Amino acid sequence: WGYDDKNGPEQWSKLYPIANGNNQSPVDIKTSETKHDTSLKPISVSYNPATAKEIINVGHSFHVNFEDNDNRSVLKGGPFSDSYRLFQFHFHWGSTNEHGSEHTVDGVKYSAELHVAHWNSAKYSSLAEAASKADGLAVIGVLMKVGEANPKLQKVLDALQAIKTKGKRAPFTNFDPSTLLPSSLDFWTYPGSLTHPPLYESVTWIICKESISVSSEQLAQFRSLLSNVEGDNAVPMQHNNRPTQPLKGRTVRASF
Ligand SMILES: [Zn+2]
């Protein structure tokens, strides 16, 4: 599978039938249809920079992984009763500044999106077990609006030159991803899924109301990563965002 015309999102249903499920992500958040909930508590994140471990080029994107053997880095509050353990963060982008984000707000598309993923360590023993459970994963999504350069993305961007081609990986340590989140943590939440195969409907999404910035040049750095293996003709990672999917009766709740 991929994001190309032949094996792209529109064709994923052939190999992964759940792509046409009733809890698929991303979605378009229509603010006039969101339901306020006083039951929702503020989001609380506490990450230990010592848990940062490695950065990897996976062909269609790049991931920054964290050690998840204990609860040194966790997410709590919001619609959760259990604490979720941080395990990875990555981004999605488009071919030009005009698109790139996965989620949209009132039909508006942004240039990129940051995803910070966690798994339920209170109920499960590992990521593999939790990934298929309805309450197994929690992902924070932050919309990235093109504008001024974001200095907080510096360490991440400077690391790409060491993992330019598919399969390359390198140590990525002493980093706290909470520094990438917006100043305000007001959010929207809804029951969804992984945005790429296997597309499991096991994700409770936390979408931030406030966006963070990114410059046109920083976006160019994401797009310059290569999807081919070392030695082959270079093929830039042009885009990796999935189109929004039908809400199918789900309700998006707002913490504000
Ligand atoms: Zn993602």
Curated annotation (Swiss-Prot):
Cofactor (UniProt) = Zn(2+)
Q: Keyword Transferase: yes or no?
A: no
This protein's superkingdom?
Answer: Eukaryota
Which InterPro entries does UniProt cross-reference here? CA_dom, CA_dom_sf, Carbonic_anhydrase_a-class, Carbonic_anhydrase_a-class_CS
Q: Where is this region: Disordered?
A: 1-26, 236-256
Under Gene Ontology molecular function, one entry of this record is: cyanamide hydratase activity
Q: Which residues form the active site?
A: 60
Q: Which organism is it from?
A: Homo sapiens (Human)
Q: Does the keyword Transport apply?
A: no
Quote the record's activity regulation: Activated by histamine, imidazole, L-adrenaline, L- and D-histidine, and L- and D-phenylalanine. Inhibited by coumarins, sulfonamide derivatives such as acetazolamide, benzenesulfonamide and derivatives (4-carboxyethylbenzene-sulfonamide, 4-carboxyethylbenzene-sulfonamide ethyl ester, 4-(acetyl-2-aminoethyl)benzene-sulfonamide, 4-aminoethylbenzene-sulfonamide), and 'prong inhibitors' BR15, BR17, BR22 and BR30. Activated by a short exposition to Foscarnet (phosphonoformate trisodium salt), but inhibited by a long one. Esterase activity weakly reduced by cyanamide.
Q: Which residues form the Alpha-carbonic anhydrase domain?
A: 1-256
What does the record give as EC number? 4.2.1.1, 4.2.1.69
Binding locations of Zn(2+) 1: 90, 92, 115
State the top-level EC class: lyase
Protein name, per record: Carbonic anhydrase 1
Residues annotated to bind substrate: 195-196
Per UniProt, subcellular location reads as:
Cytoplasm
What is the predominant subcellular site recorded for this chain?
cytoplasm
- Enumerate the residues binding Zn(2+) 2: 60, 63, 196
Pfam assignment, any one: Carb_anhydrase
Q: What is the lineage of its organism?
A: Eukaryota, Metazoa, Chordata, Craniata, Vertebrata
UniProt family annotation: Belongs to the alpha-carbonic anhydrase family.
**UniProt keywords, alphabetically:** Acetylation, Cytoplasm, Lyase, Metal-binding, Zinc
> What biological function has been recorded for the protein in this entry?
Catalyzes the reversible hydration of carbon dioxide. Can hydrate cyanamide to urea.
Q: Name a GO CC annotation attached to this entry.
A: cytosol
The reactions it catalyses are:
hydrogencarbonate + H(+) = CO2 + H2O; urea = cyanamide + H2O
